[PDB]
């Protein structure tokens, strides 16, 4: 019986000198917020870890962090590197910003052959939102196109200290996402949720308008439609210094041609996350909350 793989997208947590970022210990026994993941991907049922990371900090990776899970789970790495192009692209001569997060989902494609969750690294999406997610991707063994993404209600993910960048989705009455559109400086000023657009103009949302959190679920046809989206970002904006190749994007595309659906999860689970350093006491004081409630041990790994 098949069990469905994380894929941890890992590749942003190395410093820019060859070096792991200080890795924080925040949950009261010291664990870090991929460690809940972690925790919480084995207890739905994930059957093993891929990490996409780059070489560049690969021996802290390997020194630090594997060694809390290898014999707990199977683990694997994959790499994102600059150079790693469909055949027949180079990278240009001035290029040094990685190419985005669907790129390092396409560094998943050898090693990922079955059903599989894409999460942030750090991130804390709760409990619920990895066994709804688990339950899912079960269901799609063997299919092309049926993907899935766990939904999380804006209001829920906000900041006192700034605004937010989230992935505002429109669903409709199936459940299934029509369009997925990154927007930034969403804040709730004095009461109402708003946003600015493309054009200057000022958006409302909801409380409980649907966001990604970037948790999805895919087949490995996912990797095949995004190389094929990947050639097209090349061609078009390949020679650009920042542009980047983002999952939101690809996935909008698809659900626009009617050749992938995906239907929104809606969980019980609460994200919580460190946008501003202010952000921090708070969630330090969730998982001390969650701790004495029993829904964790004190010491995970």
Known sequence: AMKPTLFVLAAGMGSRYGSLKQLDGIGPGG??????????????????LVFVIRHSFEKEFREKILTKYEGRIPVELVFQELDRLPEGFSCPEGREKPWGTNHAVLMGRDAIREPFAVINADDFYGRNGFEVLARKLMTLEGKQGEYCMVG????????????????????DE?????????????????????????????????????????????????????????????????????????????????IRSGRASVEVLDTTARWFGVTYSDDRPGVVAKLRELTEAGEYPTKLF
Not at 36 to 47: E, H, K, L, T
Not at 152 to 169: A, D, F, I, K, Q
Not at 230 to 246: D, V
Request: glycine share 10%; net charge negative; charged share 25%.
């Open 31 to 48: 664990d870090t917020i991929m460690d809940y993941s972690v925790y919480d991907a084995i207890r739905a049922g994930f059957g093993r």
């Open 174 to 254: 199936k459940h299934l996402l029509t369009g997925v559109v990154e927007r930034t400086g969403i804040e709730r000023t004095d009461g109402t949720i708003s946003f600015r657009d493309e054009t200057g103009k000022i958006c409302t949302l909801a409380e409980d308008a649907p966001v990604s959190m970037n948790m999805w679920g895919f087949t490995p046809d996912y990797f095949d439609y995004s190389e094929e989206l990947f050639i097209n970002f090349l061609n078009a904006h390949g020679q650009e210094p920042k542009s980047e190749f983002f999952i939101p994007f690809v996935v909008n595309d698809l």
């Open 152 to 171: 999380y209600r804006v209001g829920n993910t906000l900041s006192e200290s700034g605004g937010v960048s989230r992935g505002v989705c429109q669903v």
